[PDB]
Structure 1
Amino acid sequence: LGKHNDWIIGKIGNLRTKHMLNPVYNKTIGSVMTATGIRLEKLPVVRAQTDTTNFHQAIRDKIDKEENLQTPGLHKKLMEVFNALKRPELESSYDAVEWEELERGINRKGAAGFFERKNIGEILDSEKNKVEEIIDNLKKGRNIKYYETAIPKNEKRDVNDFVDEKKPRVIQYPEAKTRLAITKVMYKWVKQKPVVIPGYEGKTPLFQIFDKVKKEWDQFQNPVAVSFDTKAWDTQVTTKDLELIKDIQKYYFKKKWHKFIDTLTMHMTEVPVICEVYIRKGQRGSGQPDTSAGNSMLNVLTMVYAFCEATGVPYKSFDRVAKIHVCGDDGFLITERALGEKFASKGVQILYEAGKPQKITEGDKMKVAYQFDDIEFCSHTPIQVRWSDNTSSYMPGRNTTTILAKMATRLDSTIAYEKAVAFSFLLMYSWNPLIRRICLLVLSTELQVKPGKSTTYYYEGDPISAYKEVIGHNLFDLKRTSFEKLAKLNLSMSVLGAWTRHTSKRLLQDCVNMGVKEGNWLVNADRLVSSKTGNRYIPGEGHTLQGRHYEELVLARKQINNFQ
């Protein structure tokens, strides 16, 4: 242990460590499905929880490892790669944010560390001062007590400050106090404002992401999408790895913060981790503010490097033969055929030498999509929808099973909430006929009650109008979804035995059993329902939003500074 990690000796085994030191259902949604004959039980659990013996058997199974041996002075190439992608106009341009801009959109129940009693909301109120001594301690170079609190998956204090199934079985987060300190200074990195990590799709919302990619796709004489699949990336990050990620910070930030960065970095390269007490041999934890922007950056640098090393393309010229898209570790690049195939064979071998071993699954070769909708990217796969205007767009595609399971369920310790849920989902998965109608059908309940804000999106006004504004077309205009792709994603429902032959037509009755009755009814926004009812839906005015009150548009994200 370093001098800086000698503090855990005085605060003090069973861990058997071999390489590191051990010294409830949505009631309305759920009733909707049930009435249709969907077995809620034979749906997957989708917030599973890990026990003490096997949160411990998982930790020695994954985190207990040595810094994977890496190719010599690789980071001198990975930096050379960063030379070709840097934003020179922003060199020494990032500077800490103010308190006002930081509280803007923050989890006020942020994970509490092993030694804190105040979740993020509570420190923000009184102990704001407690945040700036830690920044002063770090901005000039003063060893503080860096510690990460380790917990198992989906537990209560799995609180973030597709993303919540993109997390490992071992959460590793530092103190709320330190989490705030790092962010109040490195927001403009750890939130990518602006996006300096190319292809970083953290900012891109889901309903846009697949239409976006296909537009690049359609520029190649014969395109192809090689996958990034690395095994447990978090543990495959090394001390040499972090210090490059250190230096990419030191480039953009102003001169006054290189001292803040280095002190934090060296603190992060040997982390005493609290659960039982172990020390960690480098690696990334899953509640560090540098997860998304550290991986994503680290990842493209690796991935651009290895593509360039295998195909022979030099680092600077990448930006014109390929198009990268990461989100943490999961990502994909699009290039011409010959290039793709050469990167999938030679890549495997390179990526292993470079400390990021792939999970080859098809003959020592990386997964390669040859048809555009064969991509899979942060838990979703592209599906095409055909519009009544004879144009075609793409939506964020998943298996109906996971969808129904994520929706009909919610962790807790209300029916306005459920109406927001219904919306959010309908934004994304309107392509799924079973979900569009389930969404609509919750949205048809208690028209008096208005949505809540606890969920991702929500709509003020009239939800069908909220949907035309973001997607760009109307729900009534969705005429035929893609036939082959929808079936593949619906096949699991048959396999798990969660629906009946009737279900795809017991639901459609319910909706028509509503939309034939005289009036102006939500369900008649479904083309099939309306044509089988003759009624229609003349929508009013409605807009989608999130948080306390922002605004989500077609390709923008306007907020509200009326009373800033």
Structure 2
Amino acid sequence: NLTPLFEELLQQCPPGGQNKTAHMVSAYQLAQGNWMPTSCHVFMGTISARRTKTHPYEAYVKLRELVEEHKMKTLCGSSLGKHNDWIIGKIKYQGNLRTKHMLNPGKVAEQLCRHNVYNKTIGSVMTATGIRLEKLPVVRAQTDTTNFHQAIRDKIDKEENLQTPGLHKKLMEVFNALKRPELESSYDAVEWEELERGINRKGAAGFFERKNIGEILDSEKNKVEEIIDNLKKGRNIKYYETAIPKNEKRDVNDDFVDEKKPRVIQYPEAKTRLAITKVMYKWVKQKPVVIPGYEGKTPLFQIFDKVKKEWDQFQNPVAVSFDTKAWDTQVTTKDLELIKDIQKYYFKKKWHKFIDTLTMHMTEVPVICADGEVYIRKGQRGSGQPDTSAGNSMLNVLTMVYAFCEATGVPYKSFDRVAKIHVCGDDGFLITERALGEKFASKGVQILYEAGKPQKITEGDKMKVAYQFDDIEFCSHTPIQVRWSDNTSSYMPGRNTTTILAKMATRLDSTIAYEKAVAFSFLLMYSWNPLIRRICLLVLSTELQVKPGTTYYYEGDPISAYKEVIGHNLFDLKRTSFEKLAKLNLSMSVLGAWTRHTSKRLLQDCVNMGVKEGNWLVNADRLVSSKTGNRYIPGEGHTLQ
């Protein structure tokens, strides 16, 4: 009766270990009365209790008393580490972050250095069909300095999560169930050439740097090699991260979902990022993949077909979603230490002192904000570290297998026999049989809280379950089935039409070639969406002399290029799933972004252009060509990046 009240309190208790000595009672037994909490330390949703016949509300006031007693004797003195001392010398002005859990030593001197504009061609195409641009959500919000420091105080300014005693030994036992011993002690640094192939030269400079990635490559390689040398020998470097709001000028990726970035971007200097990537390439880029389920290298237009083939081998498949609240701030020092031990498993012994020193620097990180304010972060992850994707994915896989096995009784070495997991940093889900998944979905919240990865406050304290394939959510997307004219069916990455329109029509800048790279990219993703697909085809049909400039672009003909990645011709897309299309279209009607005329004014504009003589891309749309009589004859075309 009082059970859900206790379930909520137990997610405020400090995690503890087993007891045996004392009777260990759950939130159920507590609300049944006649149990008195001896301690507030929780182990698997149990607490210790003396059978002294209490009132259920006396028990609750007791446990709550024990917890608040604990919380005030625990919020207490962070001595700065010698290797971070150098940042104090650069301090010039008093701090004003008002942080309650990490040092704010002050503010350094300001240093010597983008708004949301429309893509005019793409935007005018939408305006031309009655899509009302003013009703579309804002998709690239820039935070001002005051809400930025608020985001720091709100999300970063925290003490490290308590975790179950012995957790990381258990996680290490999960790792040993899925290591790849044929790769142990084999990873070595890579050559400049391999590094330079896969690296964005626009990659951002840190607070004290001036040159970006490409400029350091061109003229300051010796500075990167010196950092490698220091770390390799175990000497300290002047390691620091810079903090910027999401969608700031320096918010640039070194390598369609961009919602997978936190509000505060924290990133090491470009010299330092190159140093880490040169040595740890094979691990941070996952070449080869050793993280089970890792999908960070699978294209979004492929991922759901791959998952479908696994869903299809279960009697009663369900998927349980991982939804950790602000994952990067929940990463603890013991978590980083676990990743370090795993890296050292795969790396040759000559890089172990490198790995150790890097990790030490990452456990207490000086962070400089854009405005110069300094804070000292304990643990956590900066979203811009080269290890973010690989470290987070591995950490997520271990913690989720741990939680599932503790929850269901399945032993770690038996996970691969009853469940399939997929991860992209903190994002992911596992597929398994309905009984197993429902048992994991109810208990996972409390176990994952005690493992130091609290889940987003869900409905009834259960994790989200998908009972049908296309209710799965992953990388901001969800499966939508399409029908091909060869009588096959496949799945594409679905997402709300309102969100696709806003992403397509807007840009941060400080050219039609870029708009056609966007249109081709969105065509690769969203050709299941008749409205997106037709706008793409029109924009691509604009100024055909101009080559395209941006996750993907096409050499030669975009329609051929499409046929290469997707494996069908655009013209063979017969049908999109009726129900899932209606779901993904609802916010068009809720926001008033379209009207009853919009779908036909768009089709008409395509027919109007496609009946004309020539070779028109719009005629690659099955239904447009149906009404023009003309077809599109492709040239020779290839997808690149």
Q: TM-score, normalised by structure 2?
A: 0.84
Aligned residue in 2 for 1:5:
84
Contact 1:42/1:496 (8 A) holds in 2: yes
Q: Residues 389 and 366 of structure 1: is their aligned pair in 2 closer, same or farther, counting only changes over 3 Å?
A: same
Distance in 1, Cα, partners of 2:573 & 2:245: 42
> Deviation at 1:39?
1.4
User: Secondary structure of 2:527's match?
Assistant: coil
Contact 1:151/1:172 (8 A) holds in 2: yes
Contact 1:226/1:367 (8 A) holds in 2: yes
Distance in 1, Cα, partners of 2:612 & 2:536: 19
Aligned residue in 2 for 1:560:
none
Q: Which one is further off, 413-422 or 350-359?
A: 413-422
- Superposed CA offset, 1:159-186 (max 9, x none): 1154422111111111111111011000
Aligned residue in 2 for 1:440:
537
> Deviation at 1:345?
0.7
Distance in 2, Cα, partners of 1:459 & 1:8: 47
Kindly report the root-mean-square deviation, in angstroms, between the aligned alpha carbons of the 2 structures: 1.0
Distance in 2, Cα, partners of 1:87 & 1:288: 25
> Deviation at 1:41?
1.8
Distance in 1, Cα, partners of 2:256 & 2:449: 27
Distance in 2, Cα, partners of 1:440 & 1:213: 29
Contact 1:37/1:503 (8 A) holds in 2: yes
Contact 1:272/1:280 (8 A) holds in 2: yes
Q: TM-score, normalised by structure 1?
A: 0.95
Q: Which one is further off, 463-472 or 329-338?
A: 463-472
Distance in 1, Cα, partners of 2:516 & 2:265: 31
Q: Does 2:330 align with 1:236?
A: yes
> Deviation at 1:526?
1.1
- Superposed CA offset, 1:398-446 (max 9, x none): 1011111111112111112211211111111000000110011011111
Q: Residues 163 and 480 of structure 1: is their aligned pair in 2 closer, same or farther, counting only changes over 3 Å?
A: closer
Distance in 1, Cα, partners of 2:256 & 2:266: 19
Distance in 1, Cα, partners of 2:619 & 2:244: 47
- Superposed CA offset, 1:489-542 (max 9, x none): 111011111111100111000000111223332111111111122222222221
- Superposed CA offset, 1:68-109 (max 9, x none): 100001100100000011111111110000111111131112
Contact 1:423/1:459 (8 A) holds in 2: yes
User: Secondary structure of 1:532's match?
Assistant: helix
- Superposed CA offset, 1:232-273 (max 9, x none): 111100111100011010000001000000001011001111
Distance in 2, Cα, partners of 1:324 & 1:473: 28
User: Secondary structure of 1:363's match?
Assistant: helix
Distance in 2, Cα, partners of 1:290 & 1:367: 28
Distance in 2, Cα, partners of 1:147 & 1:536: 57
Q: Which has the larger radius of gyration?
A: 2
> Deviation at 1:229?
0.3
User: Secondary structure of 1:323's match?
Assistant: strand
Contact 1:467/1:475 (8 A) holds in 2: yes
Distance in 1, Cα, partners of 2:594 & 2:434: 40
Distance in 2, Cα, partners of 1:501 & 1:297: 48
Distance in 1, Cα, partners of 2:104 & 2:546: 54
- Structure 1 runs not aligned, ≥5 long: 547-564
Distance in 1, Cα, partners of 2:477 & 2:390: 21
Aligned pairs for 1:346-361 within 5 A: 346-361=443-458
Aligned residue in 2 for 1:27:
120
Q: Percent identity?
A: 100
Distance in 1, Cα, partners of 2:284 & 2:611: 52
Distance in 2, Cα, partners of 1:166 & 1:346: 26
- Structure 2 runs not aligned, ≥5 long: 1-79, 106-116
Contact 1:147/1:174 (8 A) holds in 2: yes
Aligned pairs for 1:47-446 within 5 A: 47-160=140-253, 161-275=255-369, 276-446=373-543
Q: Which one is further off, 317-326 or 511-520?
A: 511-520
Distance in 2, Cα, partners of 1:171 & 1:521: 43
- Superposed CA offset, 1:306-342 (max 9, x none): 1111111111111121111110101000001111101
Distance in 1, Cα, partners of 2:192 & 2:198: 12
> Deviation at 1:31?
1.1
Contact 1:360/1:367 (8 A) holds in 2: no
Q: Residues 388 and 163 of structure 1: is their aligned pair in 2 closer, same or farther, counting only changes over 3 Å?
A: closer
Distance in 2, Cα, partners of 1:213 & 1:156: 36
Distance in 1, Cα, partners of 2:516 & 2:256: 20
Distance in 1, Cα, partners of 2:619 & 2:201: 40
Q: Which has the higher contact order (CA 8 A, sep 6+)?
A: 1
Q: Which one is further off, 286-295 or 406-415?
A: 406-415
Q: Which one is further off, 520-529 or 506-515?
A: 520-529
Q: Which one is further off, 292-301 or 465-474?
A: 465-474
User: Secondary structure of 1:411's match?
Assistant: strand
Q: Which one is further off, 180-189 or 144-153?
A: 144-153
The aligned length equals 544
Contact 1:151/1:171 (8 A) holds in 2: yes
Distance in 2, Cα, partners of 1:61 & 1:226: 28
Distance in 1, Cα, partners of 2:189 & 2:244: 30
- Superposed CA offset, 1:39-76 (max 9, x none): 11211121110111110111110101111100001100
Q: Which one is further off, 9-18 or 361-370?
A: 9-18
- Alignment match of 1:36 (pick from 129, 136, 139): 129
- Superposed CA offset, 1:450-498 (max 9, x none): 211xx11111121111111211111111111001101111110111111
User: Secondary structure of 1:543's match?
Assistant: strand
> Deviation at 1:360?
3.5
> Deviation at 1:28?
1.0
